[PDB]
Amino acid sequence: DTYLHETLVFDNKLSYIDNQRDTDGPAILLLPGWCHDHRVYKYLIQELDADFRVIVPNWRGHGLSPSEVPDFGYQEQVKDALEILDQLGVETFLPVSHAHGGWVLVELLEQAGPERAPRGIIMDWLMWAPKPDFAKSLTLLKDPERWREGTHGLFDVWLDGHDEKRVRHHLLEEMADYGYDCWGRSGRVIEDAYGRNGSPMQMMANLTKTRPIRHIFSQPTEPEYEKINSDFAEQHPWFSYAKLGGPTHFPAIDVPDRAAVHIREFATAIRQG
Amino acid sequence: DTYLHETLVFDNKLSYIDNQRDTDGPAILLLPGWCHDHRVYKYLIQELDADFRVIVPNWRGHGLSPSEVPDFGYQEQVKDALEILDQLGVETFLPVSHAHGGWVLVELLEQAGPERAPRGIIMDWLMWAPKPDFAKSLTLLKDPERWREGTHGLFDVWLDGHDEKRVRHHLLEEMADYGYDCWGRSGRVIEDAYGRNGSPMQMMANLTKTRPIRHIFSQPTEPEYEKINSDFAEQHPWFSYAKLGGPTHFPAIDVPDRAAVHIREFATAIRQG
Ligand SMILES: Cc1cc(=O)c2ccccc2[nH]1
Ligand SMILES: Cc1cc(=O)c2ccccc2[nH]1
Ligand code: NA
């Protein structure tokens, strides 16, 4: 929280982490998903603080004081992220997303191009089109009468029967101040993203300039899900994955050391040409 | 449609009008706005055909067969337009834009400089930051559930209670094949353009090399809008305007003779040193 800043981004005052580390590029851009903020990355920032410049933008209506804002999508998140990087004078960066931060990361690869964003790490991001249970969850979040029932079902899936203190603290304390305006929006945007782009996999395959992307995930834990990642990886030389074997949907929190080594590896690859 | 061509522009096959008129410069570059094409200029091309070389580039995913393309902005439109001018071996040109074609025209003045692009004509282009009605329209266009409602509200404003046959034909027939991918994009880019640059007026004032620019418009029709143009013109010797008193947002269609004389005047000024 030493590193927490505010700046005007077009019409919106956005909070963002920036450790202002004077070191060789690329900068690490940690991308929150929906209805949480930089706090998800507090442990991963500890892993990276000393060796890298670390930037964590918070979305419109996101941060330590969540607020009602006009409707926006992953395109707006991309412009917001770049506008912060333009203000900070950051050129080359390695974007790292959690879950539906991924929609922002892939579009940011498309819009920034392969000189500015040569690689991407996507963390715990449902690679297939929505299964019935997840589809239902999106429907609940959009429902003004059942949005909290939506979050409760998703919390259950994300903790996956683990009494994981740090991740429980994130869901129940650090995301407590987020209301229907955010959760409803997340349901609409993610449902729309899947409907329009088909899947994260279809979207990455569809990039104008394919680049090295790694998916590091703990869940879903079933072999069928490992197989779709293995099947995509076999088909696409630029695509790789690592199953982190962490307890929850939030490897940034519950295996921050493991998330860090994959990021350092990609950051190192970028420095080596 | 004698003059309709196709060419590879970086990664995209773009259609463009070129009458290949062998005459003295400058070439007249008619710039379409968002989610229409060269058809908007069919009557203005008739006015200019005999006396000038006339070039009308169509944007990525724009033309007689609209298509889904990766997200691009006014910067990409500028590079596309220049790449076509480079391929055609056109040196000096007079750019003429309709509505949010203007973002392309002003950036094209910046990038081409005052030797290559000594003047610009901007047609019916909202000079002020978005008013509530237009802001709402941008919000609707971006909405995948209400984008068509967005276009319908804009059609209403643009026809302004006129049974204008040619302009009705343009909106309802010649723009009929344009879907959410374009209209959604137009909303995001125009909202971004205003948010980034403030207004067309702020953007023109901010040019590295200020040059003669005329705004010719029919709407908005209210004296307050004439005043902001009069106020900008008083402040900037290079800036002028003419109220065309055409029924609609499309003076290229409903007063093509009037658009033509202002273009000829500027083209003549350029030939006279
Ligand atoms: C923080 C976070 C993680 C998720 O997987 C998610 C999924 C749907 C909606 C909102 C979401 N928010
Ligand atoms: C043809 C055309 C004129 C406009 O004033 C406009 C405004 C917003 C979006 C798209 C647009 N398209
Ligand atoms: Na591979």
The answer, for B132 touching chain A at a CB cutoff of 8 Å, is no
CA distance A173 to chain B (A): 32
Chain A residues in contact with B192 by the CB 8 A cut-off are: 10, 79
DSSP B66-102: --------HHHHHHHHHHHHHHHT--SEEEEEEGGGH
Q: Is A157 among the domain residues?
A: no
Q: Could you say which DSSP state residue A80 is in?
A: H
Q: Is B18 among the domain residues?
A: yes
Question: Could you tell me the resolution of this structure in angstroms?
Answer: 2.0
Phi-psi region for residue B41, left (φ > 0), alpha (ψ -120 to 50) or beta?
alpha
Q: Is B51 among the domain residues?
A: yes
The answer, for B11 touching chain A at a CB cutoff of 8 Å, is yes
Residues 6+ apart with CB under 8 A from B114: B209, B211
Q: Is B267 among the domain residues?
A: yes
Sign of CA dihedral B224, B225, B229, B230: negative
CA distances from A175 to A6, A7, A43, A172, A191 (A): 20, 22, 16, 6, 21
Residue contact A11–B195, C-beta within 8 A: yes
Total length of chain B: 273
Contact A157, A131 (CB under 8 A): no
Longest alpha-carbon distance in chain A = 52
Q: How many domains does chain A have?
A: 1
Q: Is B151 among the domain residues?
A: no
Ligand 1 mean position, distance from CA A33 (Å): 6
Helix or strand or coil: residue A176? coil
Pairing mode, strands B4-9 and B12-18:
antiparallel
Residues 6+ apart with CB under 8 A from A64: A4, A15, A37
Contact B95, B122 (CB under 8 A): no
Residues 6+ apart with CB under 8 A from A145: none
CATH at residue A227: 3.40.50.1820
Residue to substitute in A139, A158, A186 for testing ligand 1 pocket (most ligand atoms within 8 angstroms of CB) = A186
Expressed as residue numbers, the domain containing A209 is 4-127+199-271
Contact A57, A3 (CB under 8 A): no
Residue A225: closest CA among A204, A262, A200, A205: A200
Ligand 1 mean position, distance from CA A247 (Å): 17
Q: Both tokens of residue B12?
A: 């995209």
Q: Is A61 among the domain residues?
A: yes
Q: Is A257 among the domain residues?
A: yes
Q: Which residues line ligand 1 (CB under 6 A)?
A: A 33-36, 99-100, 141, 154, 186, 190, 249
How many Cβ atoms from other residues are within 10 Å of residue B24's Cβ? 11
The answer, for B139 touching chain A at a CB cutoff of 8 Å, is yes
CA distances from B163 to A156, A197, B28 (A): 59, 40, 30
Closest chain A residue to the Cα of B181, Cα to Cα: A196
**Using CA atoms in the order A18, A19, A24, A30, what is the torsion angle rounded to 10 degrees?**
-50
**From which experimental method does this structure derive?**
X-ray
Residues 6+ apart with CB under 8 A from B5: B15, B16, B17, B18
Give the ligand with the smallest distance to the CA of A137.
1
Contact B133, B141 (CB under 8 A): no
DSSP chain B: -TTEEEEEETTEEEEEEE----SSSPEEEEE--SS--GGGGHHHHHHHTTTS-EEEEPPTT-SSS--------HHHHHHHHHHHHHHHT--SEEEEEEGGGHHHHHHHHHHHHHHH---EEEES---SSPPHHHHHHHHHHH-TTTHHHHHHHHHHHHHTT---HHHHHIIIIITTT--HHHHHHHHHHHHHHHHHHS-HHHHHHT-SS---EEEEE--S-SHHHHHHHHHHHHH-TTEEEEE---SSS-HHHHSHHHHHHHHHHHHHHHH--
b/e A86-96 (16+ beta carbons within 10 angstroms → b): eebebebbbbb
Longest alpha-carbon distance in chain B = 53
Neighbour-count burial of B248, counting CB atoms closer than 10 A to its CB (0-12 exposed, 13-18 middle, 19+ buried) = buried
Q: Is B149 among the domain residues?
A: no
